[model samples]
Target: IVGGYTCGANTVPYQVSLNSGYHFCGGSLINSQWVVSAAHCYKSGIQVRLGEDNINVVEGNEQFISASKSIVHPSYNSNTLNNDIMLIKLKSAASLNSRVASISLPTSCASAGTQCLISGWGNTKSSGTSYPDVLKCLKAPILSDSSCKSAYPGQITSNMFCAGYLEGGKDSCQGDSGGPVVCSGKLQGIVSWGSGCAQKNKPGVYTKVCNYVSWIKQTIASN
Candidate 1:
């Protein structure tokens, strides 16, 4: 339990599994018909599976929705990894149920030092390939942009921010991309990338959600 404790299946109901033939990434249900994930996770055959804890076993409570459309920011650059957020439009609206729900976006930006929760089915350890059947959670604190910049040096842009520990032991690894970073019960960030899993002085980086609130609203409205 370096990162966090095991959470109940439906505890983080808004979490969705992004499958590009397999569980390749994680996403958060932003609305009945839309999910938010990382732009870097974009690929063909992508689909969002809701209300699932064990992705390998499809249960009666799960909902599989095909992507009708996806909007990745025009400014997204693979080299710089800027504007890494992506929004997905589902083929049909999801039916809100006990096992399925949507998370609220943050009203205000999360400040540095704010503790947040990140959940996913990614590798339990950095050097391991095995993924957990149940979703895993990590409790990490947001680091100041200055401190974060010092770690990455010219790589951290305004669109990105860092969270996690200066000490090694807990972090999101492979297969955890595009997951939500919830602060105060609201979505504040999207899992983007990191140097390595739980490496000391290397916190996980995320696409700051507050910077694109208006873009999200506008994009969803226009489409």
Candidate 2:
């Protein structure tokens, strides 16, 4: 998963679905037998979908995929939003490869000042609501650990990464809570949130993709 919201597809001929329930946002296709999403989606079912053009729903392209198992990072904390990452192993491989491709995880994690690409299928307007069909994405530079902390004050953490516009117009919002903020053809961040979407002085925060390289690889290897 790249952002706070999850998905591996882009706009056009889009489709989104859950493993076996109602629609929500967030996800990435890690491999033939794996999908990545957020820890918050744990209480839910499997088959997380992303990056569709239709913000509403796509019954034609919609498919049922099982989340064989879920592994939330041990460090994840709902209250502080710490270690907010999770991976879902699929019961079977997905066939919809034409429209979807997994983003790569960066070998070098974001430092205090790195640039990243963030995309999602959430609200175009700040704090409004998520779009049902179309997808959205943007670029944001990373704030250093210190700067990220100062920029985010109490909200930032060593494990968490920061990215956003200084003016704060573009951002991932509701339904984008577990998507990708990628860069250099690699997964760099996962879109989390801030005080509000596109709020001035409050760039969006996300899970630093690099920080979890070992965990992601190890999980995939063992599973």
Candidate 3:
């Protein structure tokens, strides 16, 4: 969110950039035709960019496709930012190649102290003036539920989890909404929200992917 470097081209092929007419939101390729992001990122005229690291340049590996449909969780609570996950069904199934692929879903919850990677093209600083054009990847550790609750004080929920540093410095910032939070090589969470960019005692909150596995499957099946 806040601190990171330019990521390699094929390092995170599942990473995606969603354009909703005005701004860009990050997401992940979970299935050939489906993307996993935050429900709070829903917008009109959305298009997804896959196999892309830089937003301005035309990379051969990159593919821009329109979304046929966008599905936000039925119980999504905008007030508390609960159930922040969403799925984007691509107009056509993605063609997986060296620089295009889908990430596997998590089977279980990630425990505290688990190492994870967060990537996005968001602001580099909490007060930064511009959003980054190239994707940035940073490493952070997942925090326990108790530690998370302590930071936000009753704001944390079962549908959400926390990850980042306590002392601040590096984290997901504005414009990174709905990105993938990969832990232990699996899709564990989706970037949902936070108190601020990377601040002391406040880490970024994410939608717990494992908690909505059934809903994800059901939504994809019915829609």
Candidate 4:
């Protein structure tokens, strides 16, 4: 996370690292057995590690579980990155505690200028590989759909939104994709893509979680 600070232990209990030998993406525990992330991060053999503050250290509160099944949105478009969301079912239910918990999904959409918190173990730099050992967090405001569309003309869709400074500095970089962006204590967004990490007028794009509430609930209920 560029221009962010290290998160305190258990500060982001819902945050999980999507790993295949190493951390590749971030996700949020939506329930004891289900996690929400970006479709682009979906892959076989993904290991979900919860209660992780630092990816490199052996944190006692961490719970490593394998993904039993992964489901990408049916309408997901890779070319335009629309509906870029996915769900993963855990092999076993997570043991929730102070350091491991689930976040509630949004009941309503977040408006523009909503200050949100984004946490991840993604790269800390825009140019090089600077993945953080500890999780980093940034506070960015959600940009209006119009503004977001203007930033990435013909790219932003109803399922996508942008969050960050128009002048640049803070953003979710590579490896941060599939991470959560919490607004008003609800899961509002999922890190998906961006033009460049923290570039001016190029805010980090996210999967608008509100647009997929029914899909998420229905998917979890059926499966």
TM-score to native of every candidate shown: 0.96, 0.83, 0.96, 0.98
Per residue, candidate 4 scores C-alpha lDDT tens digits across 26-94 of: 999999999999999989989999999878899788999999999999998888888999999999999
lDDT of 3 by residue, 1-223 (tens): 6877777776888899998653478999988899999888998799998988778887788888899999898899999998998899999998998688898888888998998999988888866556878888889889999999999997999988899999988888888899989987799989899988888999999899999888888888887
List where candidate 1 sits over 4 angstroms from the true fold: none
- lDDT, candidates in the order shown: 0.88, 0.65, 0.87, 0.94
Q: List candidate 3 stretches off by more than 4 Å.
A: 21-23
**Positional deviation of residue 37's Cα in model 1 after best superposition, in angstroms:** 0.4
lDDT of 1 at 51: 91
**Candidate 3 Cα RMSD (Å):** 1.2
Deviation from native of the Cα of residue 69 in model 2, angstroms: 0.9
**Residue 104 lDDT, candidate 4, scale 0-100:** 97
If both were scored by lDDT, which would come out higher, candidate 2 or candidate 3?
3
In terms of lDDT, the poorest run of 10 residues in model 3 is: 126-135
Off by over 4 Å in 2: 1-20, 55-63, 130-132
The whole-model C-alpha lDDT of candidate 1 against the native structure comes to 0.88
Superior by lDDT: candidate 2 or candidate 4: 4
Clashes of each: 0, 37, 6, 0
Clashes of 1: 0
